[PDB]
Every structure is written in structure tokens, then in C-alpha cells.
Design an enzyme around this catalytic site. Sequence first.
Site, PDB file in Angstrom:
ATOM      1  N   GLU A 111      26.491  46.537  37.861  1.00  7.98           N
ATOM      2  CA  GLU A 111      25.348  45.629  37.780  1.00  7.98           C
ATOM      3  C   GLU A 111      24.062  46.237  37.236  1.00  7.98           C
ATOM      4  O   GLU A 111      23.219  45.507  36.748  1.00  7.98           O
ATOM      5  CB  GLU A 111      25.047  45.038  39.183  1.00  7.98           C
ATOM      6  CG  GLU A 111      26.259  44.308  39.718  1.00  7.98           C
ATOM      7  CD  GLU A 111      26.502  42.976  39.068  1.00  7.98           C
ATOM      8  OE1 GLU A 111      25.598  42.611  38.213  1.00  7.98           O
ATOM      9  OE2 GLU A 111      27.458  42.308  39.335  1.00  7.98           O
ATOM     10  N   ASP A 142      20.612  37.235  33.229  1.00 12.21           N
ATOM     11  CA  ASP A 142      21.866  37.878  33.260  1.00 12.21           C
ATOM     12  C   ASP A 142      22.583  37.625  31.974  1.00 12.21           C
ATOM     13  O   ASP A 142      21.984  37.186  30.983  1.00 12.21           O
ATOM     14  CB  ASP A 142      22.692  37.783  34.566  1.00 12.21           C
ATOM     15  CG  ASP A 142      23.354  36.458  34.787  1.00 12.21           C
ATOM     16  OD1 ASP A 142      23.158  35.627  33.820  1.00 12.21           O
ATOM     17  OD2 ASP A 142      23.993  36.180  35.784  1.00 12.21           O
ATOM     18  N   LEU A 149      21.297  37.232  41.806  1.00  8.05           N
ATOM     19  CA  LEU A 149      20.980  35.986  41.090  1.00  8.05           C
ATOM     20  C   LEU A 149      19.857  35.215  41.749  1.00  8.05           C
ATOM     21  O   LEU A 149      19.898  34.885  42.936  1.00  8.05           O
ATOM     22  CB  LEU A 149      22.164  35.013  41.164  1.00  8.05           C
ATOM     23  CG  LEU A 149      21.812  33.643  40.567  1.00  8.05           C
ATOM     24  CD1 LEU A 149      21.615  33.759  39.071  1.00  8.05           C
ATOM     25  CD2 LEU A 149      22.938  32.658  40.802  1.00  8.05           C
ATOM     26  N   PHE A 172      31.347  39.371  44.641  1.00  8.62           N
ATOM     27  CA  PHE A 172      29.956  39.581  44.475  1.00  8.62           C
ATOM     28  C   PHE A 172      29.520  38.920  43.194  1.00  8.62           C
ATOM     29  O   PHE A 172      28.531  38.221  43.100  1.00  8.62           O
ATOM     30  CB  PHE A 172      29.714  41.083  44.430  1.00  8.62           C
ATOM     31  CG  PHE A 172      28.237  41.492  44.359  1.00  8.62           C
ATOM     32  CD1 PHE A 172      27.616  41.658  43.120  1.00  8.62           C
ATOM     33  CD2 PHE A 172      27.527  41.849  45.511  1.00  8.62           C
ATOM     34  CE1 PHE A 172      26.295  42.107  43.026  1.00  8.62           C
ATOM     35  CE2 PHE A 172      26.198  42.278  45.429  1.00  8.62           C
ATOM     36  CZ  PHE A 172      25.588  42.425  44.179  1.00  8.62           C
ATOM     37  N   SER A 188      46.823  35.023  40.403  1.00  6.30           N
ATOM     38  CA  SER A 188      46.469  36.422  40.458  1.00  6.30           C
ATOM     39  C   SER A 188      46.490  36.920  41.888  1.00  6.30           C
ATOM     40  O   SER A 188      46.982  38.012  42.178  1.00  6.30           O
ATOM     41  CB  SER A 188      45.078  36.570  39.917  1.00  6.30           C
ATOM     42  OG  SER A 188      45.161  36.926  38.558  1.00  6.30           O
ATOM     43  N   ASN A 240      47.621  38.842  34.390  1.00  3.85           N
ATOM     44  CA  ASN A 240      47.170  37.518  34.710  1.00  3.85           C
ATOM     45  C   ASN A 240      45.657  37.515  34.850  1.00  3.85           C
ATOM     46  O   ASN A 240      45.002  36.604  34.386  1.00  3.85           O
ATOM     47  CB  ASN A 240      47.815  37.021  36.041  1.00  3.85           C
ATOM     48  CG  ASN A 240      47.462  35.600  36.391  1.00  3.85           C
ATOM     49  OD1 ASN A 240      46.566  35.312  37.220  1.00  3.85           O
ATOM     50  ND2 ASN A 240      48.145  34.667  35.712  1.00  3.85           N
TER      51      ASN A 240
END
Length: 162
Positions: free
Chosen positions: A11, A20, A32, A104, A117, A132
Site C-alpha cells: 500500500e 488510489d 480509503l 484489506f 478460488s 483461478n
Amino acid sequence: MNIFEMLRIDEGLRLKIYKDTEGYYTIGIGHLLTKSPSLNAAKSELDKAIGRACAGAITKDEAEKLFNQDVDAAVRGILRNAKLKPVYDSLDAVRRCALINMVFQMGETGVAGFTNSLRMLQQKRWDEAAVNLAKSRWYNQTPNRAKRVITTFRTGTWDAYK
Ligand SMILES: [Cl-]
Ligand SMILES: [Cl-]
């Protein structure tokens, strides 16, 4: 290596409101603020989160304070989610970090839609899950990060991060 170091790598750190990769207002370590195109809206949100008149900038400490909050929220979200919990429970420590990384970033809800998945991770079919996972917008939008996370799941090691 631990989750915090892991996410801190994926990040980055910024003390000033930024957009972002999807154009949303974020700050600190991937916190965010708002989806909304409005900078004040963003600004407002920040003052409300910090609890002070920020003027769109925050300290290191503030950034880490938010980060602790978000990582905890992630873990609890996973531990509370009927779809995620069993997967998480099934995994080894390294791979659990990878599942926290995804949450996250995309939210529990985003993650909870990787049905296939998730099922493959649960059956410990590493190579197949890796493939996948890659067939997703997530991967196509942030490939390098998606790849790090994916290798983490495929291997069970922190190599992608060293
Ligand atoms: Cl695709
Ligand atoms: Cl990326």
C-alpha cells in the site's frame, strides 16, 4: 515478515490525501476515505476519522493508528464471515496473511465472491487456486500486487516479498 510489513509494502505510506489506483480518495496506508469524487467530502471524512481539523494531511502516527484499526477490522471481519472463516481456519499462518491482504484491499464482500478460488484454497490445491485467482479484474487492475499475494498462496512462503 508480518502482515503489517506486508501491507505496508503493498500500500505504501502517504500523509496527504491522494487518489488510489481507482481514483478514490485515500490516505496513510491504504486507508480509503471515500469513493466519491468530492475532495471536501474526502476532507470531511478525514477530519471525522482523525477527529481533528486536518487540512488534508496527517501525521505518521495518525497513519499508523488508522492502519491498526483497518487490519484489526479485517481480521475480525474474516473471523465473523460465514464464508471466509472456514477458509481462514483451514490455512497455515503465511497463507492466512495473504487472505487478510485481500480483504484489506477489496473488502470481505469482494473476497467472499471468489467462490471457486476459496474452495480450492480450502482443498489445498495451490497451483489451481493461483490460476483461478488470476482470472479476475483484481489481477488485471493491480497485477504486481495481485501476483505477490497469489505467490504467497501458491507457495506458503514470503519469497514474493523478499
Ligand atoms: Cl479474466
Ligand atoms: Cl500492482
